[PDB]
Amino acid sequence: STGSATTTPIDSLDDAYITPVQIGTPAQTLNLDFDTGSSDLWVFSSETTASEVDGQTIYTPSKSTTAKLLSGATWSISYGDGSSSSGDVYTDTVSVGGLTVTGQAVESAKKVSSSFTEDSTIDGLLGLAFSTLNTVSPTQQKTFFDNAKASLDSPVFTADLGYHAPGTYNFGFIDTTAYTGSITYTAVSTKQGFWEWTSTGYAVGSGTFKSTSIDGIADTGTTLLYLPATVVSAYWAQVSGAKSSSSVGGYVFPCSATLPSFTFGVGSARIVIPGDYIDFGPISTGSSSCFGGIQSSAGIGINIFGDVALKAAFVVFNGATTPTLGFASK
């Protein structure tokens, strides 16, 4: 089997991407944020505290003839930004882009943080990291990908995010029309439950490539590129008037600037992030200070190749017995 779904930016900055997901019988379509940095499929629901819902579409298990309460099971997650959600669990039929999983754990939110309530466009998250990070207790649950894997033509999914444009998530096949050149594969460590890999270095604009190992995770659920402070300082030093602002919470730059590209290594290959991808616009409405899309990881404890980096590539998440990542230009 295979599946193929379009993923759409939620706003003009590509802060996040939503993908339609069919849950239950008859289908209830919710727009979920596919998140390669977490392992819970959780949704706004008929159980969510009413004051914490503001425009999201909700899953109503009582309207699904295939929904079963997973008796005794609860979940609670805290994301790296400080956001959170928690609740109880149903199993139901879940379909993405024509690929169907029966008996998928659908984590129903009783509580969400204000940061989720405020995002009316996001109806929940579909985690695609390893199932060892799933938060359901007392019986840990599998991701949609882990449940689908055995049925897929090939045990893979691919992320093809757009810059200010829709893109695609494919499950079970590699669309050889969607990238240029060849795919360069690189080793993955699953020891922390992430798609963790090592980049071979970086360049700033037209500058020389610096060979240096940078461990990090491929995380579609994170907007920006978080890298070590040495690398980030080298990038922003090439932008007149850029500075790190403790008041704003990262590097800012004059909105009049033209940003240089950023290149990262994948083995002997190179992925080039155009400068425009690194512009996240005014810090507040009307400001002439703009927020940068490359930020320090120093306060995080991990480097994160989030959407700023991933949208510059066609990315293969290879879930074979020995997982690997693949990157291609596009």
Ligand X SMILES: CN1CCCc2cc(CN)ccc21
Nearest to 136 by CA among 73, 184, 199: 73
Which position among 14, 33, 35, 92 bears the catalytic label? 35
CB of 173 to ligand X, least distance (A): 26
Q: Which of residues 143-162 bind ligand X (CB under 6 A)?
A: none
Closest CB to ligand X among residues 79, 163: 79
Closest CB to ligand X among residues 64, 85: 85
Q: Is the dihedral of CA 137, 54, 286, 223 positive or negative?
A: positive
Q: Does 16 bind ligand X (CB under 6 A)?
A: yes
Closest CB to ligand X among residues 127, 260: 127
Nearest to 192 by CA among 170, 171, 218: 218
Give the binding range for ligand X (CB under 6 A) out of 112-120, 234-242, 265-273, 289-297: 112-120
CB of 15 to ligand X, least distance (A): 7
Q: Which of residues 34-73 bind ligand X (CB under 6 A)?
A: 35, 37-38
CB count in 10 Å sphere of residue 218: 27
199 is catalytic: yes
Nearest to 220 by CA among 241, 200, 240, 194: 194
Q: Which of residues 191-220 bind ligand X (CB under 6 A)?
A: none
* Rounded Cα–Cα distance for residues 238 and 258 (Å): 10
Closest CB to ligand X among residues 81, 175: 81
CB of 96 to ligand X, least distance (A): 18
35 is catalytic: yes
Burial of 136 (0-12, 13-18, 19+ CB in 10 A): buried
CB of 188 to ligand X, least distance (A): 19
CB of 37 to ligand X, least distance (A): 6
Do the Cβ atoms of 248 and 291 come closer than 8 Å?
Answer: yes
Closest CB to ligand X among residues 19, 93: 19
Q: Which of residues 73-92 bind ligand X (CB under 6 A)?
A: 79, 81, 83
Do the Cβ atoms of 118 and 13 come closer than 8 Å?
Answer: no
Q: Which of residues 241-270 bind ligand X (CB under 6 A)?
A: none
Side chain identity at residue 229, one-letter code: A
The 8-class DSSP code of residue 116 comes to: H
The 8-class DSSP code of residue 235 comes to: H
Tokens 């759409």 belong to residue: 8
Both tokens of 113, joined, read 């943080």
CB of 219 to ligand X, least distance (A): 7
Which position among 38, 95, 199, 297 bears the catalytic label? 199
* Rounded Cα–Cα distance for residues 202 and 228 (Å): 11
Q: Does 105 bind ligand X (CB under 6 A)?
A: no
Both tokens of 35, joined, read 């998140």
Q: Does 116 bind ligand X (CB under 6 A)?
A: yes
Give the binding range for ligand X (CB under 6 A) out of 30-38, 94-102, 180-188, 244-252: 30-38
CB count in 10 Å sphere of residue 300: 13
Q: Does 119 bind ligand X (CB under 6 A)?
A: yes
- CA 141-225-202 angle, 5° bins: 120
- One of 14, 18, 30, 33 touching ligand X (CB under 6 A): 33
Q: Is the dihedral of CA 109, 110, 115, 121 positive or negative?
A: positive
> Where does this chain bind ligand X (CB under 6 A)?
16, 33, 35, 37-38, 79, 81, 83, 115-116, 119, 122, 221-222
Which positions are annotated as active-site residues? 35, 199
